Each structure stands twice: as structure tokens, then as C-alpha cells.
Amino acid sequence: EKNVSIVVAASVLSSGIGINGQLPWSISEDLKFFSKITNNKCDSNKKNALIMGRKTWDSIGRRPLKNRIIVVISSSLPQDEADPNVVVFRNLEDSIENLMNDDSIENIFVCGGESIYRDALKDNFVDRIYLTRVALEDIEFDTYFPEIPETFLPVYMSQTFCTKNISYDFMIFEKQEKKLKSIDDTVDLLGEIFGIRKMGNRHKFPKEEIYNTPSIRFGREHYEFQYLDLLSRVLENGAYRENRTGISTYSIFGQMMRFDMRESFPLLTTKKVFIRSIFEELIWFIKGDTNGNHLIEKKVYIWSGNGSKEYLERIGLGHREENDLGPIYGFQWRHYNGEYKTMHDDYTGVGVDQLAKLIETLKNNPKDRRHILTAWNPSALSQMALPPCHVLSQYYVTNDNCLSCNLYQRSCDLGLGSPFNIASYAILTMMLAQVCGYEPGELAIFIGDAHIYENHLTQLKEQLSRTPRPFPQLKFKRKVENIEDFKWEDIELIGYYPYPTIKMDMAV
Amino acid sequence: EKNVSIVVAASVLSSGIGINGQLPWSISEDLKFFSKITNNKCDSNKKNALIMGRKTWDSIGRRPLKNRIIVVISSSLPQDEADPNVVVFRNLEDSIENLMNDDSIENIFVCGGESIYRDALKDNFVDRIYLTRVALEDIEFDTYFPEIPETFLPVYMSQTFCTKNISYDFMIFEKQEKLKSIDDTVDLLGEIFGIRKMGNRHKFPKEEIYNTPSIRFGREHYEFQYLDLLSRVLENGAYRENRTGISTYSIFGQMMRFDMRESFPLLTTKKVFIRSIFEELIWFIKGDTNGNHLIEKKVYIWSGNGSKEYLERIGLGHREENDLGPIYGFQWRHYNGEYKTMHDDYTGVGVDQLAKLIETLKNNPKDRRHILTAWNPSALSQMALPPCHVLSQYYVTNDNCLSCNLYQRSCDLGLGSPFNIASYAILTMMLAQVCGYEPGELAIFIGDAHIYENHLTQLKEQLSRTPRPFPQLKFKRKVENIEDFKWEDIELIGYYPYPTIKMDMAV
Ligand SMILES: NC(=O)C1=CN([C@@H]2O[C@H](COP(=O)(O)OP(=O)(O)OC[C@H]3O[C@@H](n4cnc5c(N)ncnc54)[C@H](OP(=O)(O)O)[C@@H]3O)[C@@H](O)[C@H]2O)C=CC1
Ligand SMILES: NC(=O)C1=CN([C@@H]2O[C@H](COP(=O)(O)OP(=O)(O)OC[C@H]3O[C@@H](n4cnc5c(N)ncnc54)[C@H](OP(=O)(O)O)[C@@H]3O)[C@@H](O)[C@H]2O)C=CC1
Ligand SMILES: C#CCN(Cc1ccc2[nH]c(N)nc(=O)c2c1)c1ccc(C(=O)N[C@@H](CCC(=O)O)C(=O)O)cc1
Ligand SMILES: C#CCN(Cc1ccc2[nH]c(N)nc(=O)c2c1)c1ccc(C(=O)N[C@H](CCC(=O)O)C(=O)O)cc1
Ligand SMILES: Nc1nc(=O)c2c([nH]1)NCC(CNc1ccc(C(=O)N[C@@H](CCC(=O)O)C(=O)O)cc1)=N2
Ligand SMILES: Nc1nc(=O)c2c([nH]1)NCC(CNc1ccc(C(=O)N[C@@H](CCC(=O)O)C(=O)O)cc1)=N2
Ligand SMILES: O=c1ccn([C@H]2C[C@H](O)[C@@H](COP(=O)(O)O)O2)c(=O)[nH]1
Ligand SMILES: O=c1ccn([C@H]2C[C@H](O)[C@@H](COP(=O)(O)O)O2)c(=O)[nH]1
């Protein structure tokens, strides 16, 4: 018995695989992939067979593929042995029987053509599916990959990769089929005896009804799962608790998330994330601005709630003007320890400029272990509309000249805050990198109180039902000399195809 | 063919399993284990059989064990027919013969006796060994569990558990003999992208540097949290120079978890000197920055960075020897206080975070703002050394335990890390006592996790020893103020470490 699996690359949304007899894109790595997986075998004396429609044969240029034996499906072509490494069959049904014969053939691959895919599937001929998702969407297709039958389940999803600014993705699907205990049993019993006295019971693995893409058990490589799985983890273990807002949450303490920034930009796809607001709040921080009006003026309202007259009055800052947030994130970054008056005052030269120092240090002493930025000032906490949630960040230059960032975040609203925080510190690191002459590295976020407000429960359940797509790419149109110079127009987001936005009320 | 497992509870160091015909300790949970493990079966119509020597039959009361069939090995006991759930045999070989029928009998267990354990092993009878390590030594034993054969390799090690202040854990040993689908794809994809695929930047450690390699899916003992971060840098650590003369191997952004409910995370694979740790902690707590006061008590961990040759080198030779400046203690009690010298009276100067902390944990426990920090941009220049364990957060569970999170920007795995873990396990226990809570969990998030090149051979020495159960740490009395804690107030129970490992600090 031998294996027969499909290999294909289609657009992420509509699954387009071709146009005018050609691929709709040019990605080396993907072909290098097709080659690697297609030649993969363990019997030297044997070879793999690659079935393909005639038109695809025309696209390949009718030349053989090294170490393999192409197999064309055509109504009209000769069965001669001009080339031993190429055979032809009148139909796909018959094309199978490489099993029946050819102990010289180890594995079979359907390299397709739409018609051929749609039949290999229709007749239950295929076992596995190697699918390369390409974030190239808005563009003419004449050939598409058939909708995957529900008898298949994804078991692997790779991280996102980049080529010519195009994001993409390797997935594997498999068909469903019928029907050492010692450790699991011992641990279970030990769990019955000790209850929550055994830490493991305090960190129970998420039940599948709340596990994203459950079928992917050992292949959760997409680093978007770092966020989706945290969501699951708290949905499963989160203790119910009251808080200052009056809207209770489910909270666990001390989690982590890593994201790569070398090959892509971590902007969540399982829901539409509004990146106009993340960047805008970012330079707003970078410039050391604490006037919430400047934000509202650019139609960004994320700080209105904690800026209103009532709330300010409620927390004892009734003297402030309608949106004077006090010495929050911006102020601490540019003027740590500055004596704060109002948002109208000029703070030029007052306080310690950490961002400026960070940059001068990253350039001059890169391997220095003190690249730190903090917003936690005990002396100023009472003047802040809100004490800083993402509390301090550390920056780290690799030997191969990338800039990575670590951020501890005391309080994290998984539904509303986190997506923003991820995109933000990714952008900040990139900006920092360009300005210091580096490439983006990795992003790691350490969370203290990781929670999900109880009025976000059905919305997050919704998001958890959507399988993640490839992360988009983010590029700067120009190299600026001063970090405080970036503008929205300077930003280019390439290949972002999120699921629909999901409304979620913030708790003031 | 049927499974044969041993079940035993022996002391961690000398393998003592008995004294004067009875167990040398009383641990309820362990018996519950024995009961659950030996009762565990698939077929309801079948039963398991427990083999034991006559003396064990004696100590067991000579009454049957519910739901199971006892098999007594005795040369003398009368082979009657009376109790259906108990049988006697004249030798081990013959009892096997459980294996050949009683298909009623699903699984087999050797519940031992020094003589029976020794024989089940000597004759290649056992497939598995369930071993409860009890952290009790320095007490008489007249019976022992034999030495584990080399044909056996550990596959599981539970976290440390606590009963009547006694530390203990659970292990499993297997015997040796002679879907790549996803893994193949990842390999190939790795070939194609190299360092571009994040996974290649985080390679799994080679087993030559992995502690106790046999335990693949069962490294539950959270000594592994540290030991594994160690081998993880050993595998990916980028060689790089540093302020000091000694280069380092490092990776960025790591984390470790530790349970503090059933045990105290004091590393066992190497003797850790907790006393210096304690003395440094109250020193911090007091808000003291005087390196002398530390040297006073024979604690020199800070002399290195307190020497005039060092203070001179960093442009601080302007002050007395060992006047470290506004460092940990000063920022904790007197954050943003204007530092002068280690002698002035700072009463009232600066924000008292430690005080606020205790007041908040008590008055508002669910509050998401229990933070303690040491990173003060304005003071960094006056410090003999900038803070390394930089800021922590504290957390009150609904079940009244206190958890702590720590972020170290810089972390010397061989020397500092072991100290930081213990230090904060203590600080959290203190806070919890003072605030009326129980110890919770400890998580350490690291920035620059590194290993100084002059520690390589020592750390590989450490990675060669299999971890032992964590000990327990108890306070002898309840204190009024958190700064009333004294060394004698601390009680370290059940700490049996491997020999200490000498490592030099990079000044
Ligand atoms: N992105 C990706 O992963 C891939 C994309 N592609 C793209 O797909 C396109 C080709 O798709 P498609 O148009 O389907 O062409 P195909 O490669 O599927 O070729 C179809 C041809 O195969 C023969 N054939 C098909 N069905 C039968 C049958 N039932 N019995 C006998 N012969 C049969 C016929 O040729 P005849 O008339 O000679 O009998 C038919 O014209 C190209 O644009 C190519 O670039 C191709 C492979 C992979
Ligand atoms: N920690 C733990 O998990 C356990 C500890 N223990 C401890 O171990 C001690 C008992 O061990 P031990 O002293 O070895 O006594 P055992 O329980 O091993 O029994 C020894 C007796 O078994 C019979 N016997 C043993 N070997 C043979 C043989 N080869 N042929 C015929 N008969 C044999 C003999 O009985 P006879 O004289 O009738 O022929 C012998 O006197 C107790 O102190 C108990 O507390 C026991 C079980 C578990
Ligand atoms: C972190 C952070 C920054 N912040 C600051 C901020 C301030 C107070 C907070 N308070 C609470 N309880 N949770 C938060 O996430 C939070 C976040 C945010 C504030 C609001 C939204 C928000 O409601 N976002 C909507 C976007 C609406 C839109 O952009 O049009 C969303 O659907 O995501 C996001 C981030
Ligand atoms: C973290 C921290 C606290 N500190 C403070 C401290 C200060 C500067 C440092 N510098 C460097 N490079 N590494 C450190 O771990 C370090 C630690 C420590 C200092 C010394 C030892 C140490 O040498 N411990 C013993 C040796 C001394 C003894 O015998 O007691 C050991 O061999 O383990 C441990 C912790
Ligand atoms: N995943 C996937 N991607 C594809 O582009 C693809 C596919 N599958 N299946 C069939 C197909 C049809 N088109 C093509 C085009 C070129 C080659 C090809 O050049 N194969 C050589 C490439 C050598 C290389 O790039 O290293 C091979 O050696 O496999 C194969 C199929 N293309
Ligand atoms: N791991 C281990 N610990 C032991 O103490 C132990 C062992 N294994 N193997 C054999 C043995 C011999 N002594 C004893 C003493 C009492 C019981 C006993 O009464 N067992 C009951 C306990 C029920 C309970 O405590 O919940 C049983 O139901 O099995 C068994 C063996 N003792
Ligand atoms: O950058 C931010 C701003 C704050 N929040 C969330 C954390 C909490 O849900 C709330 C802050 O409330 P406190 O933890 O301070 O009570 O807003 C974030 O997640 N990230
Ligand atoms: O609590 C501590 C005290 C400092 N060190 C180590 C970290 C480095 O090995 C060295 C300080 O190096 P810098 O990052 O400050 O250059 O001391 C620790 O690991 N933990």
C-alpha cells in the first residue's frame, strides 16, 4: 500500500492557483519546497511519481523533473518510451495503479491542475495535502484549487514567511480514519489524589471546544497561536474576579507569547485589527505627548474613556482638563521623573529622555545588557489617568544584527488590549531598528494578570472558531533620520487579509 | 506475557524502605498512590495481583487488600485454600504463573520486601518501577530497596509534594530493548529557510547536554525549569563579550515556573547557600545599601562590586568602600529618594514601595497593580551596579495564595539565577505570612539569559546529576513587621543536594 498526497499553492482567500497558464506569483522557496517534499523518499532504489494535468505539463515546459517520474493525464498523447521518466495515461482512475505495480515507486503526489485536483479529491484518491497559502489576493485567477472536503483536517501550520514582500504559509491536511499510558495514568491518578495541590491541575490543558483548530496538535507553529492559545488557557483556568471597572474577568497570572518579526508582522488575522490607531498612539508616545485631544483629532478614540471629565473626577483628578491624561507612557518615555503640570506646558529638557538614550545606546553599545525603557514611576502613579500596564521593555541586539524586544505587561486585557500591544511593540522595535541600522528580530511578551472581561466571552469564542491566516508584512516607505518623524503615510501594510472585525466594549 | 511493575517508597539518598517491620514515615498520600496504582486496570472482570514477602504480609495486618489478590511468597506459610483473595507460593519463579493464567489477573505488581525486590530484579522479572522518593535521611533503616539496574531508565519525575513537612516525589522507570509526516516537513522547511525560520534560532538541545535525557514527556520536576533553560542556552547561546573580561553565551527572552505551595525551589543539583541569600534579602528589605553590614555577617557576594578598585573604575571612587549607592534596598524603601552616602538617615525620604505593597496586598488583594520596581533612570549613575532583577509583580489567588512574577534584564545562569529563585521564593513567603496568605507560584522572566564562558565545565557537571525532590522552607514564628525576620526564624527541611560546585563571579 502506498501514499498519495496533493501538493499545491493557492491564494489565501479565493484559492487561486494560476493565471494564463502561469503561477500568479514567483516564490523560490515555494518551488524549493515543492522539490524537497516531492523528492522525499527513503528507498534509494525507488522513485516518486508526480501526476499532473496536461496543461500543467505545458507550464512545466514539458521537460522532466530530476529523480522523479512525471505522469501526464491526457486524452491525446503518445505512450512511447522516448523518455523513461515520463508516462501518459488516458484518465486519472487508471493513472492510479502505481500501487498495483512498480515496487520501484515509493510515494505518489498529485501536482495537479485544477481539473486533476478536483478529481483526485472527488474519487477519494488522495490521503494527504501539502498546501502553501499565499497572501496574494487581489489579482486575476482563472484556475482555483478545489474546496477541501470535510474529510480532511489540518495538522500543521508553519510560521509566516516572506519573499518579495509576499507572505505565505505551509499547511498539511489528512483524512480521518477509524478507531505510553504509564505516564498519563500515573499523572492522572496523582492528580486525583492531590487536587489543586498539584500545580498541573492549576494549569489544565484547554478543552477542545475552546481550543482553536483542535486538529492541529503537534503542528501549532503559526505564532498567532501564541495569542489564541493564551485565550484558551484562561478560558479554561481563568478564575472569576471583580475589579475597579465593575466588569469582572477570568484571570490567570504569569503567561508568555513570542512572535517573529524577521519574516512577518504580528498583526492578528483572526479578527480585523485597526492599525491606524496603534501607530498613531505610538508616535504619540514617542513624542512624549500626553494630550488626548491630539489623538481624538486624528479620529482615534482609544483614550477617550480614561480621559472623560467624570472618570478623572471619579479617580480624584477632577482638576484636569477634559483630556489631560497626566504623566503617562509618553511623558515617562521622554521625561522620566519630570515634574508634571498640565499637558499644555513645555517639557523640553525636563526629566530623563530614555528613548533618546535607548537609541544612542543601541547604536554605540549594542551588546550592552541595559537597553531598558520603563514607564513605572512610583512618584507619579497618582497623577496618571491610569497606571502603566505594559510596564517595562528590554531591547537586545543579536550577533546577526537584529533587534529583539521583551516587554513585561502587568495587566493585559486579552480581547482589546493585547492585540494592540503586540502590534505596537512590534512597530516600535522596527522603528528602533531602522533608526539604529538593524533588522527586526523577535518579540516576546511576558504577562502578569492575563484576563478576559466577561462581556467579551461570546466574541472571543467567535474568534476562536476562525483558523488563522498568514501574517501580513509591514514596511517603511522611507528611511527617516529621527524616530519622532514617522508618519502614517510612511507605513505600508502588505497582504493583510483578516477575518471580520469583532465588536468589543472596553471597560472604563 | 503480562505486565509486571514494582511499587516502592524509599528514602532519597540511602534507599531506606523499612524499620523494625514497619514503614519509616507516615505519608497518607503515598498509600493512596499505592492503592490507586495497584488498583488501576482495564477489564472489570479481571483483577491485579500484588506479590509480597511474608514479613510485608505481616506488617500489612495479614488481611486482604480490597479488589485485588495478594500473593505471599513464603517457605513456611500454610498453602491452605481458605481466602480466595490471598494465595501463597514457595518461591518467586513459581508465582509467575500469574503470567500464564488467571487471565482473571490483568496486571502484576511486586510490592516487595527487600528480599523480594532484590529477586524480582535479579531475575529480569520487572518491566517497570514506580518509585516514591521520600526526603527523609538521618534516621534508622534496616531494610532497603535494591539499586536500580542499568537496564532501567527514568521516564517521569513528578513535582515535589509535601506531607507533614516531608518532601517527596514520584518517579517511573522503564526497561530497555533494542508521524514523521509533520516532522519531515519542518526539517525540509528548515533546510530551505535556515536562520530565517524562527525554529532554527531555538533549536532543541542535543541530548549530550540535556539533563536526564530519558525523561522526555515527564520532566515535571521544576528543577527542570532551570536545568533546561541552562541547556537551552548551551545549544543556542550566541558567543558575546561584555563589560567584564569574561565573554558569555546568551539568548534573549526566557522564562521559568516554580510551585511554592508544596515545596521551596532551592536547587538540588548543586548545593545552594541559602543563608547568604536570606541575609541579602532582609538587607534589601531594610533599605540598607551598606556593603559592610553584609561583609559583617560573612556574606561577600557584594564585595566584588564594592571594592575601591571597582568604584574607581566606574567613576565612583569619590565614596567610601562598600557604599554601593541607591541600589536595590534604597529603591525598595526610598524610591526617588536623594541619595547621599550609606550613612545618612533616609527616614521619610522617597516613596516606600515595600510598605505600599503590603498595604495593597492586604487592603486590596484583587488589585492588578501590586508592583515593586528598582529601575530608576535618574539613579542609575550612582549605583555600583544597575539593577538586574529589575521589577516584580505580586498576585493574590482566589484561594488565598500569593504568587510572584519577576523580570531579570540580565541573568547569570550559573551564579545569579539560583540565588534569584530562592531569594524571591523567600520574599514571597514573607509577604504572604505578613499579609496572611499562603505561598503560590513563582515565575521568572528573563532578558539576557547567559552563561559565562568560565562556567561551562562546571554547569555540564551540574547537568550530569539527576534532580532530587525540593526541600521545604518554614518560618519558626509569625513576625510583626516584615523586617523582623531573622536567620534563626528560618527552617530548611529535607534539603539533600549534590556537592557544591565552585564558580567564579565576573567583576
Ligand atoms: N499553484 C499550484 O500549486 C499549481 C498550479 N497549477 C496551475 O494550474 C493550471 C493548470 O490547471 P488545469 O487547467 O486543470 O490543467 P491541468 O494541468 O489540470 O490539465 C488538464 C488536462 O489533463 C488532461 N485530463 C484532465 N482530465 C482528464 C481526464 N479525466 N481524462 C483524461 N485526461 C484528462 C486533459 O488533457 P488532454 O486534453 O491532453 O487529454 C486536460 O486538458 C496552470 O495554470 C498551472 O499553472 C498547476 C499545478 C500546481
Ligand atoms: N517501603 C516499602 O515500599 C516497603 C517496605 N517494606 C519493608 O520491608 C521489610 C520486609 O522486608 P524483608 O525483611 O526482606 O522481608 P520480606 O517481606 O521480603 O519477606 C521475607 C520472607 O519471605 C519468604 N521468602 C523470601 N525469599 C524467599 C525465597 N527465596 N524462598 C522462599 N521463601 C522466601 C521467607 O519467609 P519464610 O520465612 O516463611 O520462608 C522470608 O522470611 C519490612 O520492614 C517492611 O516494612 C516492605 C514492603 C514495602
Ligand atoms: C492595549 C492598548 C491600547 N488601548 C489603551 C487601553 C486603555 C484602557 C484599557 N482598559 C481596559 N480595561 N482594557 C484595555 O485593553 C484598555 C486599553 C486600547 C484601548 C481601547 C481599545 C479598543 O477598544 N479597541 C477596539 C478598537 C476600536 C477602533 O480602533 O475603532 C478594538 O476592537 O480593538 C484598544 C486598545
Ligand atoms: C544573583 C545574586 C546574588 N549575587 C550578587 C552578584 C553580584 C554580581 C554578579 N556578577 C556576575 N557576573 N554574576 C553574578 O551571579 C553576580 C551576582 C551573588 C554573588 C555571588 C554568588 C556566589 O559566588 N555564590 C557562591 C559562591 C559564594 C559562596 O560560597 O557563598 C556559589 O559558588 O554559588 C552568588 C550570588
Ligand atoms: N506547493 C506547490 N507549489 C507549486 O508551485 C506547485 C505545486 N505545488 N505543484 C505543481 C506545480 C506545477 N508547476 C510547477 C512548476 C515548477 C516546478 C519545478 O520547477 N520543480 C522543480 C523545481 C526545482 C527547484 O525549484 O528547486 C523540482 O525540482 O521539483 C514544479 C511544478 N506547482
Ligand atoms: N510506594 C509504596 N509505598 C509503600 O509504603 C509501600 C509500597 N509502595 N509497597 C508495599 C508496601 C508494604 N506496606 C504496605 C502497607 C500498607 C498497605 C495498605 O494498607 N494499602 C492499602 C492502602 C489504602 C489507602 O491507604 O488508601 C491499599 O488499599 O492498598 C500496603 C502496603 N508499602
Ligand atoms: O496597554 C494597555 C492598557 C491597559 N490594558 C488593560 C489591562 C486591564 O484590563 C486594564 C487596566 O486596568 P488595571 O489592571 O490597572 O486595573 O486595561 C492593557 O491590556 N494594555
Ligand atoms: O541578582 C543578580 C545580580 C547580578 N547577576 C549577574 C548578571 C550578570 O552576570 C552580572 C551583571 O551583568 P550586567 O548585565 O550588569 O553587565 O551579574 C545576576 O545574575 N543576578
Short mmCIF file of C-alpha atoms in Angstrom, two decimals, chain B residues 103-325:
data_model
loop_
_atom_site.label_atom_id
_atom_site.label_comp_id
_atom_site.label_asym_id
_atom_site.label_seq_id
_atom_site.Cartn_x
_atom_site.Cartn_y
_atom_site.Cartn_z
CA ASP B 103 -6.39 -14.34 32.63
CA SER B 104 -8.52 -13.14 35.51
CA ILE B 105 -5.28 -11.47 36.59
CA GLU B 106 -4.68 -8.46 34.32
CA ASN B 107 -1.55 -6.87 35.79
CA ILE B 108 1.19 -7.79 38.25
CA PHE B 109 2.92 -5.80 40.99
CA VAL B 110 5.86 -6.67 43.20
CA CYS B 111 5.09 -4.90 46.48
CA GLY B 112 8.35 -6.19 47.72
CA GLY B 113 10.25 -6.65 50.83
CA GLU B 114 13.99 -6.14 50.49
CA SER B 115 14.38 -9.81 49.56
CA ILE B 116 11.52 -9.85 47.09
CA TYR B 117 12.50 -6.63 45.32
CA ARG B 118 16.07 -7.89 45.02
CA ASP B 119 14.88 -11.11 43.38
CA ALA B 120 12.28 -9.67 41.02
CA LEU B 121 15.14 -7.56 39.67
CA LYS B 122 17.96 -10.12 39.72
CA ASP B 123 15.82 -12.43 37.58
CA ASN B 124 14.71 -9.88 34.99
CA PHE B 125 11.11 -10.13 36.17
CA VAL B 126 10.06 -6.45 36.26
CA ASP B 127 9.17 -4.23 33.32
CA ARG B 128 8.53 -1.07 35.32
CA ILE B 129 9.35 0.59 38.64
CA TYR B 130 7.06 3.08 40.39
CA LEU B 131 9.30 4.83 42.91
CA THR B 132 8.30 7.29 45.61
CA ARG B 133 11.38 9.21 46.77
CA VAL B 134 10.97 10.42 50.35
CA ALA B 135 13.29 13.22 51.52
CA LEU B 136 13.98 11.68 54.93
CA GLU B 137 17.53 10.65 55.89
CA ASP B 138 19.49 10.51 59.15
CA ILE B 139 17.07 8.01 60.67
CA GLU B 140 17.49 4.26 61.10
CA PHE B 141 16.58 1.78 58.38
CA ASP B 142 17.11 -1.96 58.48
CA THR B 143 15.64 -2.62 55.06
CA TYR B 144 16.49 -1.14 51.67
CA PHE B 145 15.32 -1.10 48.08
CA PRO B 146 17.98 -2.55 45.80
CA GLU B 147 19.99 -0.41 43.42
CA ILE B 148 18.19 0.26 40.13
CA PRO B 149 19.63 -1.85 37.24
CA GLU B 150 21.24 -0.02 34.31
CA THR B 151 18.66 -1.65 32.04
CA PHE B 152 16.20 0.79 33.61
CA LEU B 153 15.86 4.43 32.64
CA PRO B 154 13.71 7.14 34.26
CA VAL B 155 10.77 8.35 32.15
CA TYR B 156 8.88 10.50 34.65
CA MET B 157 9.52 12.65 37.71
CA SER B 158 6.66 14.49 39.40
CA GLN B 159 6.89 17.83 41.14
CA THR B 160 7.83 17.80 44.79
CA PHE B 161 4.93 17.20 47.18
CA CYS B 162 4.60 17.89 50.90
CA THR B 163 3.09 15.99 53.80
CA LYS B 164 3.75 16.71 57.45
CA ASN B 165 6.67 18.85 56.28
CA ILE B 166 8.23 15.95 54.44
CA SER B 167 9.31 16.47 50.84
CA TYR B 168 8.69 13.64 48.37
CA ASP B 169 8.04 12.93 44.68
CA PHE B 170 7.08 10.21 42.20
CA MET B 171 9.21 8.56 39.52
CA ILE B 172 8.78 5.88 36.87
CA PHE B 173 11.49 3.69 35.33
CA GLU B 174 11.09 1.73 32.11
CA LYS B 175 13.16 -1.14 30.80
CA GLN B 176 15.11 -1.05 27.56
CA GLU B 177 15.12 -3.26 24.46
CA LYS B 178 16.67 -2.68 21.04
CA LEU B 179 4.00 10.69 12.47
CA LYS B 180 7.23 11.80 10.78
CA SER B 181 4.83 13.41 8.30
CA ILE B 182 4.89 16.72 10.21
CA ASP B 183 8.49 16.46 11.42
CA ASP B 184 9.73 15.80 7.89
CA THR B 185 8.03 18.91 6.55
CA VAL B 186 9.53 21.02 9.33
CA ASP B 187 13.02 19.62 8.67
CA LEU B 188 12.83 20.34 4.93
CA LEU B 189 11.35 23.78 5.59
CA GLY B 190 14.30 24.32 7.93
CA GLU B 191 16.73 23.37 5.18
CA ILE B 192 15.12 25.85 2.82
CA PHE B 193 14.96 28.82 5.21
CA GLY B 194 17.78 28.25 7.71
CA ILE B 195 18.09 31.01 10.30
CA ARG B 196 15.04 32.63 8.71
CA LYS B 197 12.68 30.08 10.25
CA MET B 198 12.40 31.06 13.95
CA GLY B 199 12.51 27.41 14.96
CA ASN B 200 16.14 27.22 13.81
CA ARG B 201 17.01 30.03 16.22
CA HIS B 202 15.54 27.95 19.06
CA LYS B 203 16.97 24.50 18.47
CA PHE B 204 16.09 21.68 20.81
CA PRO B 205 19.17 20.83 22.93
CA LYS B 206 21.24 17.81 21.88
CA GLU B 207 20.89 15.05 24.43
CA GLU B 208 24.58 15.31 25.32
CA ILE B 209 23.68 18.44 27.29
CA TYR B 210 20.08 17.59 28.24
CA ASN B 211 19.75 16.60 31.93
CA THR B 212 18.34 13.08 32.39
CA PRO B 213 17.51 12.62 28.63
CA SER B 214 15.38 9.52 29.23
CA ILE B 215 12.64 11.67 30.74
CA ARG B 216 11.17 13.09 27.56
CA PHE B 217 7.50 13.69 28.32
CA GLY B 218 7.74 13.55 32.08
CA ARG B 219 10.03 16.33 33.25
CA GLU B 220 7.50 17.68 35.73
CA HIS B 221 10.09 18.33 38.44
CA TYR B 222 10.54 22.07 38.10
CA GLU B 223 14.21 21.81 38.82
CA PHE B 224 13.93 21.13 35.09
CA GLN B 225 12.69 24.68 34.51
CA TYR B 226 16.18 25.88 35.42
CA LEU B 227 18.22 22.91 34.21
CA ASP B 228 16.53 23.13 30.80
CA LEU B 229 16.99 26.87 30.34
CA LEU B 230 20.62 26.04 31.02
CA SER B 231 20.92 23.51 28.23
CA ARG B 232 18.77 25.70 26.01
CA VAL B 233 21.41 28.45 26.03
CA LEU B 234 24.15 25.85 25.83
CA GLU B 235 22.59 24.91 22.50
CA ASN B 236 21.74 28.34 21.03
CA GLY B 237 23.73 30.82 23.10
CA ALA B 238 25.49 33.36 20.90
CA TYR B 239 29.10 33.97 21.96
CA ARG B 240 29.47 37.59 23.00
CA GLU B 241 31.71 39.88 25.04
CA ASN B 242 30.56 42.01 27.97
CA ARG B 243 31.54 44.83 30.33
CA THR B 244 33.61 42.25 32.20
CA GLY B 245 36.66 40.44 30.84
CA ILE B 246 34.79 37.15 30.56
CA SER B 247 32.72 36.54 27.43
CA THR B 248 29.32 34.91 27.66
CA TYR B 249 26.93 32.60 25.76
CA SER B 250 23.44 34.04 25.58
CA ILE B 251 19.91 34.03 24.25
CA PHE B 252 17.19 36.63 24.88
CA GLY B 253 13.75 36.19 26.46
CA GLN B 254 13.23 33.07 28.56
CA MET B 255 11.03 32.02 31.49
CA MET B 256 10.86 29.59 34.43
CA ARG B 257 7.98 28.47 36.66
CA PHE B 258 8.15 27.14 40.20
CA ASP B 259 5.48 25.88 42.55
CA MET B 260 5.81 27.18 46.10
CA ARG B 261 2.73 25.51 47.56
CA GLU B 262 4.20 22.05 48.17
CA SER B 263 7.93 22.94 48.17
CA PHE B 264 10.69 25.59 48.18
CA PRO B 265 12.62 25.91 44.88
CA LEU B 266 16.15 25.54 46.24
CA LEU B 267 18.24 23.83 43.56
CA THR B 268 19.27 20.29 44.45
CA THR B 269 21.67 19.53 41.60
CA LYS B 270 24.22 21.79 43.34
CA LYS B 271 24.46 22.94 46.97
CA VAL B 272 22.97 26.43 47.16
CA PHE B 273 23.89 28.65 50.10
CA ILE B 274 20.54 29.99 51.13
CA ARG B 275 21.96 31.79 54.16
CA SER B 276 23.75 34.43 52.05
CA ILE B 277 20.51 34.70 50.12
CA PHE B 278 18.47 35.40 53.24
CA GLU B 279 20.94 37.93 54.61
CA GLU B 280 20.91 39.79 51.27
CA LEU B 281 17.12 39.85 51.26
CA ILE B 282 16.48 41.42 54.70
CA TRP B 283 19.34 43.74 53.83
CA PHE B 284 17.28 44.84 50.81
CA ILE B 285 14.10 44.88 52.86
CA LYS B 286 15.66 47.15 55.45
CA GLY B 287 16.55 49.55 52.63
CA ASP B 288 20.20 49.06 53.51
CA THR B 289 22.88 49.79 50.92
CA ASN B 290 25.90 49.29 53.18
CA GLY B 291 28.14 46.52 51.83
CA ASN B 292 29.90 46.38 55.18
CA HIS B 293 26.81 45.24 57.04
CA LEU B 294 26.81 42.31 54.62
CA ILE B 295 30.52 41.54 54.94
CA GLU B 296 29.85 41.84 58.66
CA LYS B 297 27.88 38.61 58.65
CA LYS B 298 30.40 36.77 56.46
CA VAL B 299 28.40 37.39 53.26
CA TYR B 300 30.74 38.55 50.50
CA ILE B 301 28.51 38.31 47.40
CA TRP B 302 28.75 42.11 47.05
CA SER B 303 32.38 42.81 47.96
CA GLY B 304 33.41 42.26 44.34
CA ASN B 305 31.43 45.29 43.20
CA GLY B 306 32.17 47.19 46.41
CA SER B 307 35.97 47.42 46.09
CA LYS B 308 37.61 50.82 45.61
CA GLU B 309 39.36 49.46 42.51
CA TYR B 310 35.87 48.86 41.10
CA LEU B 311 34.22 52.02 42.41
CA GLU B 312 37.21 53.87 40.96
CA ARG B 313 36.94 52.17 37.57
CA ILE B 314 33.30 53.22 37.11
CA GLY B 315 33.87 56.76 38.31
CA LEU B 316 32.61 56.39 41.86
CA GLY B 317 35.91 56.39 43.71
CA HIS B 318 34.53 59.53 45.33
CA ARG B 319 32.84 57.43 48.02
CA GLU B 320 33.79 55.12 50.88
CA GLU B 321 34.41 51.44 50.25
CA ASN B 322 31.25 49.38 50.01
CA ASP B 323 28.90 52.37 49.75
CA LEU B 324 27.03 50.87 46.82
CA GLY B 325 24.66 53.80 46.36
#
